[PDB]
Amino acid sequence: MWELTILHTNDVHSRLEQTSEDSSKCVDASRCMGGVARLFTKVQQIRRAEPNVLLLDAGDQYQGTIWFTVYKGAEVAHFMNALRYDAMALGNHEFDNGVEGLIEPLLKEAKFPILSANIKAKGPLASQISGLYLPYKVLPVGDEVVGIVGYTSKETPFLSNPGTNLVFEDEITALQPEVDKLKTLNVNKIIALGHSGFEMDKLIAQKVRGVDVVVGGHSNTFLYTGNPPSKEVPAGKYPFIVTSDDGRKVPVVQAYAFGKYLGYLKIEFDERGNVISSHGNPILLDSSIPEDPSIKADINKWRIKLDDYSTQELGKTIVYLDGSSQSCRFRECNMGNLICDAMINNNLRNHVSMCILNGGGIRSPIDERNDGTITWENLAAVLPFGGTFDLVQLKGSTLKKAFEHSVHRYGQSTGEFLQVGGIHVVYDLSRKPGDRVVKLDVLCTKCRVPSYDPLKMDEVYKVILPNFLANGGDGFQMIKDELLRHDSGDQDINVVSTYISKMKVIYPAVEGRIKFSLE
Amino acid sequence: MWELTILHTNDVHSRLEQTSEDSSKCVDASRCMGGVARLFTKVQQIRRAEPNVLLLDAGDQYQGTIWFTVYKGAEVAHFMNALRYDAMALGNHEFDNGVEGLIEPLLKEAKFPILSANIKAKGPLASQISGLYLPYKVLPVGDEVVGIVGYTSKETPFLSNPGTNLVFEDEITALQPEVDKLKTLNVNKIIALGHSGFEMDKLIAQKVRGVDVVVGGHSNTFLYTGNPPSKEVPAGKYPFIVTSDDGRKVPVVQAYAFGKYLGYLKIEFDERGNVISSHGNPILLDSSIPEDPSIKADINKWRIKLDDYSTQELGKTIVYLDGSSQSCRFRECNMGNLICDAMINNNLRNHVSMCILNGGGIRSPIDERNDGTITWENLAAVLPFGGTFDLVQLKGSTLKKAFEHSVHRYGQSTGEFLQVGGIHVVYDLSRKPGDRVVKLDVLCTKCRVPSYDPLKMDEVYKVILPNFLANGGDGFQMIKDELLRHDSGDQDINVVSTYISKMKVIYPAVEGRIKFSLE
Ligand SMILES: CN(Cc1ccccc1)c1nc(Cl)nc2c1ncn2[C@@H]1O[C@H](COP(=O)(O)CP(=O)(O)O)[C@@H](O)[C@H]1O
Ligand SMILES: CN(Cc1ccccc1)c1nc(Cl)nc2c1ncn2[C@@H]1O[C@H](COP(=O)(O)CP(=O)(O)O)[C@@H](O)[C@H]1O
Ligand SMILES: [Ca+2]
Ligand SMILES: [Ca+2]
Ligand SMILES: [Zn+2]
Ligand SMILES: [Zn+2]
Numbered sequence A, B: 001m002w003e004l005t006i007l008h009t010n011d012v013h014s015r016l017e018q019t020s021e022d023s024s025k026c027v028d029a030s031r032c033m034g035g036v037a038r039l040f041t042k043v044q045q046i047r048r049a050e051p052n053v054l055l056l057d058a059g060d061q062y063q064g065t066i067w068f069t070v071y072k073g074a075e076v077a078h079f080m081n082a083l084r085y086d087a088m089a090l091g092n093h094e095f096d097n098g099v100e101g102l103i104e105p106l107l108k109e110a111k112f113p114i115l116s117a118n119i120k121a122k123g124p125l126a127s128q129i130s131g132l133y134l135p136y137k138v139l140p141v142g143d144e145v146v147g148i149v150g151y152t153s154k155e156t157p158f159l160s161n162p163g164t165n166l167v168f169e170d171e172i173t174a175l176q177p178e179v180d181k182l183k184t185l186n187v188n189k190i191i192a193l194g195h196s197g198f199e200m201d202k203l204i205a206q207k208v209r210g211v212d213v214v215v216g217g218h219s220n221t222f223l224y225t226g227n228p229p230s231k232e233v234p235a236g237k238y239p240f241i242v243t244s245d246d247g248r249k250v251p252v253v254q255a256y257a258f259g260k261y262l263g264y265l266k267i268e269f270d271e272r273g274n275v276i277s278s279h280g281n282p283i284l285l286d287s288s289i290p291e292d293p294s295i296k297a298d299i300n301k302w303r304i305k306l307d308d309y310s311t312q313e314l315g316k317t318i319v320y321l322d323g324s325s326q327s328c329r330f331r332e333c334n335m336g337n338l339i340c341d342a343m344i345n346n347n348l349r350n351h352v353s354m355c356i357l358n359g360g361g362i363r364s365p366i367d368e369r370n371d372g373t374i375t376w377e378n379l380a381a382v383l384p385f386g387g388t389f390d391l392v393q394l395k396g397s398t399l400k401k402a403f404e405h406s407v408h409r410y411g412q413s414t415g416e417f418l419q420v421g422g423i424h425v426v427y428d429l430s431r432k433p434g435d436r437v438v439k440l441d442v443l444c445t446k447c448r449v450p451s452y453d454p455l456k457m458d459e460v461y462k463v464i465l466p467n468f469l470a471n472g473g474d475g476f477q478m479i480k481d482e483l484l485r486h487d488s489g490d491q492d493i494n495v496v497s498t499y500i501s502k503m504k505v506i507y508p509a510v511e512g513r514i515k516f517s518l519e
């Protein structure tokens, strides 16, 4: 038997420092979690104990906090290099700052292979990106070799800005010939490492002949065997077992997000590279694990430059600003109401009364226990993308279809669920998709006293929304296709920041803007 | 036959200048109404035409605009004297600034008799107030005499600050011996002029033997025969006929409020002072009637001092601020929501989440068509009383009873109807009084994310409300009797003014805080 320990992270999203349990800024250091210093301690402890170890990342290191806004990936190359990651697969957020934002800060500076087998470069770009990422890497581990084959979401063109020169093939189509090539090179132990979501990961496990294990990301999937150590509810056992079409049991793993957990899988291989068994569980990187002092001091050095975004108080909150995915993708969330109220307040300076906002665009909560203080740093984790809040004119029919889209596949923690302003929507999830909106009232504009009236299909409404939605992001194709007017607006973070400074003390409530009917 | 023309006003409430149709500040002079200059023109036109005329006021000249805040009744004595009023009865708002606020500005300066037969002075006050008001006045009108007997609401001690030295008797008990005294003096034509409301007026007509006509006020009752000329819906025909217990047809009249109409009743008397017939209608004092130039110039002179309250823009509204009685005493009104939002914003600077406000305390709307400008003058007509917004701690049971009180006699345009903040109430008017509240949800305080939960009878809530309600005003005896804590707060007008200045542009909506169930 030959035992391999796979350590893995995914969707770290710029949480270089330790954080609160909800992955927002660490205030009470006594109960903080994650961060690269604490992760280092845990990894080193495992490397001391186990002779055959791989530390892998399944993408989306890019984007999430002021670390990325300021260092733009240089912090990722630096601290991943310091942690001695063995390999990384490209995620969609690695393309947020174009191909040049991936090439210069990360690809040219990483000391570990960066992988994607389903990304093919064309035109002038093909010439200089050659060699900076690889379809696979064969890694020596003890007296053996392990093949790692990469993959990135085929949907990346729609999720990010990878440009016109990169082609994203179907993951299964692209993976099979690379796995077959590795098998002809006598590599009998193969890990598929990539960034497409748990559903695609299970499909890769089922269909790509020769993959022994799948390490994934993108869906922030939490898997656990037994009693979970924190608030994340398991979506399945760890590892999640898939029976392949050629009859093999293939473990599929993922480790939630934000560096809160370290994924840990032990695989028992035979001499021909068959998986005899596997077991493990994600390790909660809580305060019981000490933060490595060398890494922590280097984090404290890089932290100096970021304190310009922490010293200015924009305002105060006396309520928890719930920007969690568990709230904002399933129900009305007070962070969504705050952001929509700021959006409407900004354009009103009777003009435009309605706001829609994809809940998945709210990327972090903000805690009120830090003497209620809100800084640019706190808001930057909520709104990291540098988008704008645009003015659009829609038909009632278009809006009805958008609200049907908001809940068409409700229950999967998808970002399309809409947060609102100037709208009172009631859904009935017992009804079929496309017919779940049972009430949709909107604030009148052509009235001297604003009040709620039923939306009319043949009428025209002005809505403030992110450019992400005006461009048909999150499958809101009907908005881009059917809109009547589209005016570009102010930068998202500046809109909210200005609103918080005007109000001084905020207390946004959940107040019945979105409801679900029991009957 | 001897014909008398009675001209009458009531509840003028400091509308010395002409106003908008809704009785708020005149902006578009082309369509403005009321005011003392326009009233003078109409009265003079009638005096030229009819030889036997009386111009009467049924109280509540005091309180309503910056005119009263600044001149404190000196403007009332002055312009009533200029209009040559023949008599006035004391209203409840004539006692708002104590007995000294009635005595010095008005009683010592009026050139016409001021009347009340059911007000008896005691102690040290009895000595100097003697003669300044009278129970009645016998007035020469041509070759005849007409007796006018006054009356003031027996409830004045609870509605105003008349002090401990004045006793308010039952109107009928006090009126009968004065009417009997007038009959022994061979006065066969008697007008009862007073300030108790249309219901008491009908009772006086029915029960006080010898009263030929009742001229009233206090309930802002609009009566009309035929098609009404503006937005006020008639409560009955003009005059309203009562058959007395001794078998006589007694006309009862009232002329709405704010000087928008001039009450006009022609009475045909026989030689023994029996009413043979009567007819008339309130005259809409609209732009077709020219404003008298002499009065208008004198109004413009007194106006100079008030322009200090008009030059400073506190902020802007882009919506009509509906502070009308027709909205605020019957349904959720956006002026109530604005005032409750300002009340909560002021104390929050999780602390206190709920607001209740008697709709009758909202004394005027504010128009948005004046380039949306809001001044101290505009807010002073909304909040003329100089009250405070106090913090109180109530049991859920107490709150439930207050909300039952808010709709116990719904439909009568009474001021107890509550406007709210941090409360979602649903009423069912088909149910019996005391059991009409079908839903009452309140914003949690002991929660990190505020949200609505059903009120609990045995729990404790902190509510911001006017001192008027904390003192059990508008029959909210349960608040004064059952409250657990009462802290005095900031001046009402300053709270709203400060909130408007912080927001800069306001757009309060009607948003479902108060609802009525159809079933
Ligand atoms: C501007 N920009 C990025 C971008 C778009 C185009 C061109 C360049 C850049 C975004 N803008 C906005 Cl508003 N919402 C977004 C965006 N990126 C994701 N999201 C949201 O995040 C949800 C997915 O979150 P997760 O479940 O954590 C997976 P992942 O971390 O891969 O995003 C989506 O369903 C969206 O709602
Ligand atoms: C402070 N103060 C006065 C006052 C109280 C006590 C001691 C000294 C002064 C008031 N405070 C407040 Cl908040 N609401 C009031 C008040 N005076 C009336 N109201 C309201 O106005 C309604 C009646 O209005 P109307 O139908 O037009 C008759 P009227 O014009 O006679 O008031 C009442 O039902 C109350 O809701
Ligand atoms: Ca194998
Ligand atoms: Ca008579
Ligand atoms: Zn991610
Ligand atoms: Zn992703």
Ligand SMILES: [Zn+2]
Pocket: B011, B013, B060, B093, B218
């Ligand atoms: Zn009045």
Ligand SMILES: [Zn+2]
Pocket: B060, B091, B092, B093, B195, B217, B218, B219
């Ligand atoms: Zn009154």
